């Protein structure tokens with residue numbers, strides 16, 4: 285079945301995984317070095333053994349493709365994935381008036397009295413952002429994030445570089461290039477950055493008419509962190525191909541520290557019992573071509589037959 | 601045997617390798633996505649089925665570790681690997697007086713009348729550099745090269761960042777970090793650069809007391825390009841460990857486009873006949889610790905028993 289590699293990776297870590305403490309102190313079964321591949325021309329590698337929200341993936345990927353970093357677009361799409369990174373500033377501000385949100389993520393992990401206020405103040409910030417146009421401009425904009433990294437590489441002399449764009453250009457002008465790299469790691473922002481990018485760098489490859497891509501990520505939270513990574517990066521491969529007129533090939537996913545949090549194991553042993561069902565089919569709008577405007581209804585997911593959702597706890 | 605993975609990779613490309621044209625127009629059997637590992641605590645992965653010059657590797661690696669980019673150090677060590685990248689400027693200059701060296705690399709590939717003059721002018725430039733102190737300052741300095749990338753990351757506001765240093769610092773202050781990355785890919789230099797770095801990015805990993813490293817390279821000239829890459833990056837793993845007081849673990853080598861030039865096949869089929877002999881032993885000076893001054897005689901290679909040298913042609 286199409287997703288097997290991920291179940292094998294999960295399985296693997298569970299066995300030969302070694303214990304490793306965490307920054308956000310927990311334990312983790314970890315492995316260093318691993319590659320898995322999926323032939324995109326055989327189905328979309330969207331996990332069927334667990335409910336995965338393609339809606340979240342798409343909207344998020346379009347945000348990235350717009351080089352947009354303001355949280356407004358995501359909320360607009362009922363997407364809240366990155367909210368916590370905005371809230372961390374809103375609260376660490378002079379304007380913040382209210383429930384001392386210090387370490388709110390951890391306190392809500394088990395959520396006692398802090399629970400309500402945190403999630404209540406959350407509605408606040410998102411209400412503020414979504415409508416207060418100026419608030420959005422200050423607190424909604426995350427700054428350095430995949431989109432700005434991808435399409436707005438802050439140079440040494442003020443100008444901006446659109447890596448992704450100039451890359452598709454590269455694929456078009458001369459596809460057989462070993463220089464099709466889109467780096468997200470900048471040495472000067474990483475030390476003073478909330479969360480250095482996980483999906484660090486990706487390289488495309490054109491041969492026999494098909495487009496293949498390789499994603500390198502220094503860290504991998506296998507339970508909930510990998511199933512999104514796979515899909516999103518498999519989606520980018522159809523978009524580029526469709527843009528450049530290439531037939532989609534296969535997506536390769538290489539990991540630095542691949543791991544399973546110590547408080548995720550029950551849930552993962554649980555998943556390993558179900559058997560994968562036929563891979564979902566991705567459908568792409570034939571009319572529009574400039575992927576940079578390939579909005580929500582331009583990407584359609586056909587016949588996804590997932591196993592129920594397995595809840596787990598945020599890694600704080 | 602220790603090197604098997606490389607012979608398997610060679611073997612692989614020869615079989616399921618697909619044809620691919622080149623920038624420097626030749627043909628190439630290519631594969632996209634591949635990882636191979638070596639347990640450094642079992643021997644030094646220095647190929648025994650072909651003579652590999654450890655001298656060249658060391659001197660070159662120390663140049664890198666000094667953040668030095670001037671070709672003087674290399675010539676000083678009887679090392680000429682990077683010369684061609686210096687000559688390309690010396691000749692593309694107002695000062696150049698003599699044999700129009702245009703495309704000298706290609707013309708010398710089959711070397712007719714151009715042969716002598718090119719190699720003669722080469723002695724010239726290197727004689728100039730090695731002794732003419734000021735000449736060295738202008739034409740010897742390559743500018744953007746692994747060393748300066750590693751230890752002199754040109755920031756947005758003039759200052760310089762020593763990635764490698766701050767990284768060993770990271771390994772020391774807190775080893776269990778998934779953020780130990782040393783990137784060599786800079787989005788703004790790559791488009792106006794002679795040869796964008798191949799060995800693009802490497803991440804270390806500390807666990808169970810051992811240091812493991814993963815090297816990502818977008819391109820791999822398997823015949824002569826990989827056997828150096830393996831060794832050099834395996835050497836860096838002993839140096840860091842020895843510096844940080846860690847036991848060496850294993851080195852992981854991941855490739856973007858791994859390939860075998862169409863005019864290298866005979867030589868590679870040739871190699872695949874010999875059987876690997878016990879791996880060489882690396883010896884490290886116990887006294888000095890600051891790897892940045894771990895000079896030539898501080899690294900010793902014990903009992904290397906290689907098969908004879910298989911000549912091949914430079915990929916122009």
Ligand SMILES: C#CCN(Cc1ccc2[nH]c(N)nc(=O)c2c1)c1ccc(C(=O)N[C@@H](CCC(=O)O)C(=O)O)cc1
Pocket residue numbers: 337365479505508509510512513594595596597598599600
């Ligand atoms: C990926 C990504 C972007 N993100 C953000 C993101 C940011 C930092 C991180 N940090 C750590 N340590 N682990 C992570 O998984 C992680 C993920 C996500 C955010 C939420 C869910 C989610 O809604 N629920 C999960 C699993 C349930 C849970 O564990 O709470 C789901 O299965 O849908 C998934 C991904």
Ligand SMILES: C#CCN(Cc1ccc2[nH]c(N)nc(=O)c2c1)c1ccc(C(=O)N[C@@H](CCC(=O)O)C(=O)O)cc1
Pocket residue numbers: 653681795821824825826828829910911912913914915916
């Ligand atoms: C690696 C590296 C740095 N380099 C530079 C370097 C730079 C650009 C490149 N470009 C291309 N296309 N292929 C390469 O192998 C390559 C290598 C090297 C330079 C010379 C030898 C060498 O002296 N001889 C070889 C093989 C003989 C041959 O093919 O000519 C040997 O086996 O020692 C090896 C590596």
Ligand SMILES: O=c1ccn([C@H]2C[C@H](O)[C@@H](COP(=O)(O)O)O2)c(=O)[nH]1
Pocket residue numbers: 307479480482483502503504505506508509510599777778779
């Ligand atoms: O998109 C993301 C963001 C985070 N993480 C994981 C990686 C780690 O498991 C943890 C963050 O700690 P660091 O890797 O940054 O050290 O979150 C992911 O898997 N995917």
Ligand SMILES: O=c1ccn([C@H]2C[C@H](O)[C@@H](COP(=O)(O)O)O2)c(=O)[nH]1
Pocket residue numbers: 461462463623795796798799818819820821822824825826915
């Ligand atoms: O250290 C090096 C330098 C170059 N090459 C190879 C990579 C390619 O095979 C060719 C250069 O073409 P590009 O990959 O840069 O496109 O040289 C190596 O293997 N190692």
